[PDB]
Write a protein that binds this ligand. Structure first.
Ligand SMILES: Nc1nc2c(ncn2[C@@H]2O[C@H](COP(=O)(O)OP(=O)(O)OP(=O)(O)O)[C@@H](O)[C@H]2O)c(=O)[nH]1
Ligand SMILES: Nc1ncnc2c1ncn2[C@@H]1O[C@H](COP(=O)(O)OP(=O)(O)CP(=O)(O)O)[C@@H](O)[C@H]1O
Ligand SMILES: Nc1nc2c(ncn2[C@@H]2O[C@H](COP(=O)(O)OP(=O)(O)O)[C@@H](O)[C@H]2O)c(=O)[nH]1
Ligand SMILES: CC(C)(C)c1[nH]cnc1/C=c1\[nH]c(=O)/c(=C/c2ccccc2)[nH]c1=O
Ligand SMILES: [Ca+2]
Ligand SMILES: [Ca+2]
Ligand SMILES: [Mg+2]
Ligand SMILES: [Mg+2]
Lengths: 437, 309, 63, 424
């Protein structure tokens, strides 16, 4: 096998990390203290789950994780929480003073004083690996730490680990759950500086996860805890092929080859079904056809957009539970004739299916009901550019007036980096249109 | 109190809709670049559909169906009909059309060329129906309103945009007998006002001259074509389940031949209404397309047909 | 519709189905981190220069 | 970033400042001698923000009490919660400042300033992570106005990276001690434009009108005005003094509220206004806190446009109904919020309500309508200054007429700058 190091930068990164590792532990049968009874080779192993967990002589299973936050309070809840024994203290890095939702403070000012420490603690995990693949990076677009420090890390990781693949799990900003007003700046700034350094990035618009939690979980006012437990189910779906036996997406390089033919256009759209409430008394279980067909409804997407007005470069169907190849092919046949699924001319119109027979694990006392079968569709569609256009329009409104810009400049950043970043985004929107129209 | 914006100043139709909304006391107009609207009355080119339905606590409606341009551009309309199984190459109500990029009479269009020598090259209807007294060509315009639920509402008043010149088989270069457009004519107004004959008179002419009705001889075929064309594209453009909703007014242009067969010529995405009919149609757009979504404090015919087979 | 490269195992199976065929260096980073720190320290100098002028005016008024 | 250092300067500064510690000590369950007698752990979870822990589990306010005369600071020490303050932090002179900005800023206050800064250094030193300073004062007197702005300038020299916020009481002829208040305020406003990250513009005109018109008090005392001030000060400091999943310090808040450095003068507001039995519904709080009558700065928000809005609700209520009501006023009065800062109205809810009310709301508005306040003080200034009236009091303390001309010009530039963004 080949090892994968997860990095969780900022509040949104850290708390989504929490949710994912909680779920990974339940899936692999690893307990809060770190013992995995079903694991028989004590002290080590080259199993599929070992890509995400190292082992000690005492029999503990330790996440290959680094938690980074420029203030202590969020990572302090990891240190005193249910999974406190799971991590070594050196994995949990915290500063004193945060980035104040300021990209420039996170990237330049406070980034500089902590970057060499974080890379050192990453090197401590990379030296425990017999053959490192690379990195899964979790962060917000809107935070100062999430946007600013992530981009500096991603720059340095290309230098220190030039041969290794880098994946992003990015939280795209939604006004309904954010109190940050400067997020459009932070989002464009980090997307510009990270673009060449990220091989494949899974965006999750908080707006989509929020309304999925309202519409499908009957939650009146969804908290971050509601959103994170649902996001981690999608993340798990995506990373399951790295952690279990299988022949599709077995390494980080295969995510790039399958989903990203055009390197700059490395933002696949996640769609996930079914999301069903645990409080729901009576639930008629959905078939392979119904949940595959739900992957083409915009209401189940991680980012709200319309794939019908755009084109596909790749599509992957990752199934969890009771599913067999012929039921999937019958569903794809029915769906092809009904819906508008147009591919680009140079790419084959097809689907890479992966099935894992273990149904989705649900967190006990959670909001999601147990289901017989589920699916996550990863599709690289040009429709996701809708999310860039929105973010860029918000940028242009604020930036025309130089609103908030003094905070960034005051932390050493140049005004030229704003329009430089916006031009890369202007080029990115133009790349999407050439391909998709 | 609902809010709207106006991003198409040339639109004579939605100028009146803007006016009718304001004159209720329950619709405020905002600036062109304000995001916090309930209704967008949008531009023709590059309408930002990607920014719609992302404002929290606002149900957002727009007066264009994204992707409806595939029915309204001539090149795409021909490609839609040939490729779609439910319309097909052997489509009885569409003239034989071909695509080459920049009785054997044809017509080229997108500057209009009618010849045998010589964009889309369409089969030209050599023996059309000729109104008398006059011996002159016409085309029928019908207005169709598709709402947010995809109910297809045909407006009961259409109009015949007539030619005032006698039709000539040998003389093709003279455009005023072959092309029946309103601008090209302006014998302008000899037989009827502004080269516009309305449905009441045209029904009466058919009765007196041909012993049939508009409903039977022509309108049945029009309703079949409108329904066939829109239900074809419903999966591509429908806003059911979608985070923003769309309606749109369309203009269907028809041609009736000598044996009373109706032919589709063009569908029009941003159509203008006839002078008399603005007041009624623009009130209808408000009642059916806007007030259904945003309730305050029939002129249409609904097109539905579920034949079992 | 062709079902290719089918691989099976005890925990799952995978296959493809085809419907139809067709970086800056460590020098440059550590440089431009420090270039923003020069602008940060220049701006803080201009502040403590401006506040030093306020202090000399404060002495001039009382004198 | 957790600890805040509080400073109160002058009669007014110490009066409203003493009420702040009366209100928040009750909210944190701290008695008049400093001992904790609460019940919830939420009362002690972020008690470090405003209190130091002393021997015997006593809680001592991180408060420095400044004046150039003993009078008011002797009243504070005799008053109900006076014993809680650290005795070393009472730093005072003797001769006073006679409502004279020059005396506070250049002569009398210069003699005292370094001993006040020693106490600030003492408190700042034993702070794990100091997030910033807050100051209570008037701009119409001598001490709070002149010495308060001198302290602000000295604190910025020694702590250039810390946040400086003020609760600055504005003078008005309706509630007026001397005719020279417009002079003292204009000289102070120029200082605040340079040296503060936020200034809460408490207008005594507005506090009077609220007491007179919308509270039916015929003869309002300063205690009646200060009641409204202390309620607001509790409200603006709530989100730091309690949770609830809000990950914000002064800098983060300042970053999201201040789009332009000089335009950091806010319009405070409170709902319901008190001096009740039926608790307000979420719609009523929302309409009242946005209402002009409930604004603590005598400006009409309809005459300007909102750059940013912050609203913090207190009590047990439906967050869904809060979101619905906050979205209702924005979407029905969208002309009054600038389109070029998307999603500029932000909201928090705190479960713990203040004393006496079942639910309340505190409004913080960065509106361009605040220019009306500065225009009103600019007119009162010019009326006197065109005839160089009362200037001998300031020139006798070594000031030049040029410094007045500068200050006049700087405040009229501030008004021009607010006008620019109102029309854009
Ligand atoms: N899905 C999700 N989004 C979050 C969470 N926490 C914060 N966010 C979002 O992230 C953005 C704010 O960024 P944060 O991650 O809180 O900021 P940070 O990275 O800690 O950076 P600083 O606060 O500037 O140090 C907003 O869009 C929030 O809605 C979370 O737990 N889950
Ligand atoms: N195949 C055909 N047979 C007979 N007449 C035809 C024809 N194609 C076009 N015409 C005539 O040419 C006229 C104008 O052409 P067409 O309707 O294609 O373009 P147009 O753009 O002017 C319609 P509109 O602007 O109202 O959407 C029609 O009114 C019709 O009478
Ligand atoms: N709101 C309020 N304003 C006050 C109070 N005391 C004085 N003022 C105002 O402050 C100004 C006088 O300043 P003051 O603080 O007495 O002078 P200082 O002691 O030299 O700072 C006048 O405009 C008064 O209206 C008070 O207790 N509350
Ligand atoms: C999301 C919310 C409502 C917390 C918010 N967003 C931006 N601002 C605030 C609130 C405040 N913003 C402030 O700037 C603020 C200032 C403050 C706090 C304590 C002491 C002095 C000033 N106090 C606040 O309560
Ligand atoms: Ca093992
Ligand atoms: Ca002396
Ligand atoms: Mg943070
Ligand atoms: Mg006094």
């Amino acid at each position: 096998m080949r090892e994968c190091i997860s990095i969780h930068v900022g509040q949104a990164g850290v708390q989504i990390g929490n949710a994912c590792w909680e779920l990974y532990c339940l899936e692999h049968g690893i307990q809060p203290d770190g013992q995995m009874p079903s694991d028989k080779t004590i002290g080590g192993g080259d199993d599929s789950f070992n890509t995400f967990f190292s082992e000690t002589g005492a029999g503990k299973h330790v996440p290959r994780a680094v938690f980074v936050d420029l203030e202590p309070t969020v990572i302090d809840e990891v240190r005193t929480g249910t999974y406190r024994q799971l991590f070594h203290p050196e994995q949990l890095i915290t500063g004193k003073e945060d980035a104040a939702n300021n990209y420039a403070r996170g990237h330049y000012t406070i980034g500089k004083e902590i970057i060499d420490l974080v890379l050192d603690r990453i090197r401590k995990l990379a030296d425990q690996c017999t053959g490192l693949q690379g990195f899964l990076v979790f962060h917000s677009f809107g935070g100062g730490t999430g946007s600013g420090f992530t981009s500096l890390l991603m720059e340095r990781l290309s230098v220190d680990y030039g041969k290794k693949s880098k994946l992003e799990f990015s939280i795209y900003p939604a006004p309904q759950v954010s109190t940050a007003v400067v997020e459009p700046y932070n989002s464009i700034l980090t997307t510009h500086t990270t673009l060449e350094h990220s091989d494949c990035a899974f965006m999750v618009d908080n707006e989509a996860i929020y309304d999925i939690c309202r519409r499908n979980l009957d939650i009146e006012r969804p908290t971050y805890t509601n959103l994170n437990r649902l996001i981690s189910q999608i993340v798990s779906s995506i990373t399951a092929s790295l952690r279990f036996d299988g022949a599709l997406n077995v390494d980080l390089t295969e995510f790039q080859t399958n989903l990203v033919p055009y390197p700059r256009i490395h933002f696949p759209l996640a769609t996930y079904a079914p999301v069903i409430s645990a409080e729901k008394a009576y639930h008629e279980q959905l078939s392979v056809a119904e949940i595959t067909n739900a992957c083409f409804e915009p209401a189940n997407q991680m980012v709200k957009c319309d794939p019908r007005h755009g084109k596909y470069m790749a599509c992957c169907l990752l199934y969890r539970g009771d599913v067999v190849p012929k039921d999937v092919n019958a569903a794809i046949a029915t769906i092809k004739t009904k819906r508008s699924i147009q591919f680009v001319d140079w790419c084959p119109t097809g689907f890479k299916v992966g099935i894992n027979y273990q149904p989705p694990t649900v967190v006990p006392g959670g909001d999601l009901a147990k289901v017989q079968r589920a699916v996550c569709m990863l599709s690289n569609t040009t429709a996701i550019a809708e999310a860039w256009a929105r973010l860029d329009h918000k940028f242009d409104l604020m930036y025309a007036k130089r609103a908030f810009v003094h905070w960034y400049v005051g932390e050493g950043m140049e005004e030229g980096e704003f329009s430089e970043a916006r031009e890369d985004m202007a080029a990115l929107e133009k790349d999407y249109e050439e391909v998709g129209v | 109190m609902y809010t709207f914006v106006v991003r198409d100043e040339n639109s004579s139709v939605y100028a009146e809709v803007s006016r009718l909304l304001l004159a209720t006391g329950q619709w405020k107009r905002l600036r062109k670049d304000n995001p916090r609207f309930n209704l967008m009355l949008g531009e023709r080119n590059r309408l930002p559909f990607g920014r719609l339905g992302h404002e929290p606590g606002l149900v957002q409606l727009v007066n264009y169906y994204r992707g409806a341009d595939k029915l309204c551009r001539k090149a795409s309309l021909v490609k839609l009909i040939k490729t779609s199984p439910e319309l097909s190459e052997s489509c009885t109500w569409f003239p034989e059309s071909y695509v080459i990029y920049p009785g054997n009479v044809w017509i080229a269009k997108s500057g209009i060329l009618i010849s045998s020598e010589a964009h889309v090259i369409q089969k030209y209807l050599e023996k059309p129906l000729l109104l008398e007294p006059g011996h002159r060509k016409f085309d029928i315009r019908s207005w169709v309103l598709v709402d947010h639920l995809y109910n297809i509402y045909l407006y009961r008043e259409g109009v015949l945009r007539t030619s005032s010149e006698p039709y000539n088989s040998a003389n093709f270069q003279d455009k005023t007998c072959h092309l029946t457009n309103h601008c090209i004519q302006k014998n302008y107004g000899r037989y009827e006002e502004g080269n516009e004959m309305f449905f009441e008179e045209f029904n009466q002419y058919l009765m007196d001259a041909l012993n049939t009705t508009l409903e039977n001889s022509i309108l049945l075929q029009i309703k079949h074509i409108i329904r066939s064309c829109l239900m074809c594209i419903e999966p591509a453009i429908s806003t059911k389940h979608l985070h923003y909703q769309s309606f749109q007014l369309f203009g269907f242009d028809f041609m009736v031949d000598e044996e009373l067969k109706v032919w589709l010529i063009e569908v029009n995405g941003a159509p203008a209404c006839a002078q008399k009919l603005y007041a009624e149609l623009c009130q209808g757009i408000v009642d059916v397309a806007i007030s259904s979504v945003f309730p305050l404090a029939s002129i249409f015919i609904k097109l539905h047909h579920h034949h079992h087979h | 519709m062709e079902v290719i490269e089918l691989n099976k195992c005890t925990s799952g199976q995978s296959f493809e189905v085809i419907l139809k065929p067709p970086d800056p260096s460590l020098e440059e980073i550590q440089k431009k981190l420090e270039a923003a720190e020069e602008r940060r320290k220049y701006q803080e100098a201009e502040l403590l220069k401006h506040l030093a002028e306020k202090r000399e005016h404060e002495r001039e008024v009382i004198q | 970033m957790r600890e805040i250092v509080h400073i109160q300067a002058g009669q007014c500064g110490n009066q409203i400042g003493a009420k702040f510690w009366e209100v928040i000590s009750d909210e944190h369950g701290i008695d008049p001698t400093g001992s904790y007698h609460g019940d919830s752990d939420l009362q002690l979870e972020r008690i470090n923000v405003y209190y130091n822990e002393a021997t015997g589990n006593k809680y001592v306010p991180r408060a420095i009490l400044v004046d150039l005369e003993p009078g008011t600071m002797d009243s504070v020490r005799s008053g109900p919660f006076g014993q809680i303050f650290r005795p070393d932090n009472f730093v005072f002179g003797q001769s006073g400042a006679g409502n004279n900005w020059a005396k506070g800023h250049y002569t009398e206050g210069a003699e005292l300033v370094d001993s006040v800064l020693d106490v600030v250094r003492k408190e700042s030193e034993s702070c794990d992570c100091l997030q910033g300073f807050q100051l209570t004062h008037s701009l119409g007197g001598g001490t709070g106005s002149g010495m308060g702005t001198l302290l602000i300038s000295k604190i910025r020299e020694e702590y250039p990276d810390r946040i400086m916020n003020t609760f600055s009481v504005m003078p008005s002829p309706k509630v007026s001690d001397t005719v020279v208040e417009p002079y003292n305020a204009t000289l102070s406003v120029h200082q605040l434009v340079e040296n503060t990250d936020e200034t809460y513009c408490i207008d005594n005109e507005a506090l009077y009108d609220i007491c007179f018109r919308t509270l039916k008090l015929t003869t309002p005392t300063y205690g009646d005005l200060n009641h409204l001030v202390s309620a607001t000060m509790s409200g603006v400091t709530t989100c730091l003094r309690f949770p609830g999943q809000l990950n914000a310090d002064l800098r983060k808040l300042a970053v999201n509220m201040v789009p332009f450095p000089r335009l950091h003068f806010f319009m405070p507001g409170f709902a319901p206004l008190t001096s009740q039995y039926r608790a307000l519904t979420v719609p009523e709080l929302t309409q009242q806190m946005f209402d002009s009558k409930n604004m603590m700065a005598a400006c009409d928000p309809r005459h300007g446009r909102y750059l940013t809005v912050a609203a913090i609700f207190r009590g047990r209520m439906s967050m869904k109904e809060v979101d619905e009501q906050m979205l209702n006023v924005q979407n029905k009065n969208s002309s009054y919020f600038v389109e070029w800062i998307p999603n500029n109205v932000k909201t928090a809810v705190c479960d713990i309500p203040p004393r006496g009310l079942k639910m309340s709301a505190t409004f913080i508005g960065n509106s361009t309508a605040i220019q009306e306040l500065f225009k009103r003080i600019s007119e009162q200034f010019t009326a006197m200054f065109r005839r160089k009236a009362f200037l001998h009091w300031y020139t006798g303390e070594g000031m030049d007429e040029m410094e007045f001309t500068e200050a006049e010009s700087n405040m009229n530039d501030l008004v021009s700058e607010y006008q620019q963004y109102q029309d854009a």
